[PDB]
């Protein structure tokens, strides 16, 4: 599935089932679409950012994802 190996290391925001937003660096993915996101931050709605770090989310709650930032150095 090259459609997402192309997106690795890119700063990605993923939309959750409950409306949660996860912005972080896309690292890894699998067939069940569990995502590895490093130096990840969560955005919730009242605006607030909670720094979390390395998040392994299950494929169940993942909805939609989008590139927000170019890969860092």
């Amino acid at each position: 599935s090259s459609k997402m190996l192309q997106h690795i290391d890119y700063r990605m925001r993923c939309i959750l089932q409950d409306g949660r937003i996860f912005i972080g660096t896309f690292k890894a993915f699998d067939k069940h679409m569990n995502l590895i996101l490093c130096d990840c931050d969560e955005f919730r709605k009242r605006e607030e950012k909670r720094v979390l770090g390395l998040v392994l989310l299950r494929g169940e709650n993942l909805v939609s994802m989008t590139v927000e930032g170019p890969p860092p150095k």
Binding site: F29, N34, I36, G53, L54, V55, R58
Partner: protein, 84 residues
């Protein structure tokens, strides 16, 4: 070709401190003892925060893998050879 990288990363997390957020909005932070290919996590010394915000201590916990939303892993795992 069979077993995905994130499951391997979760396997690496065994023995560290992990915080776990199930669909019932309950946060479990504790020492991850074991994990399987599925997200079934046997994890210990839990500082558990409920949806209202109540905090409790619970020494042994086993979470069904289907019922994890996301898992926050320690930052040193960013240097795992499997993440290269």
């Amino acid at each position: 070709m069979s077993i995905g990288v994130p499951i391997k990363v979760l396997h690496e997390a065994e023995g560290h401190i992990v915080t776990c957020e199930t669909n019932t909005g309950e946060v479990y932070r504790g020492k991850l003892i074991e994990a399987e290919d599925n997200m079934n996590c046997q994890m210990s010394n839990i500082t558990v925060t409920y949806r209202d915000g109540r905090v409790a201590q619970l020494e042994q916990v086993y979470i069904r893998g289907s019922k994890i939303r996301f898992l926050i892993l320690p930052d040193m795992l960013k240097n795992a050879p499997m993440l290269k």
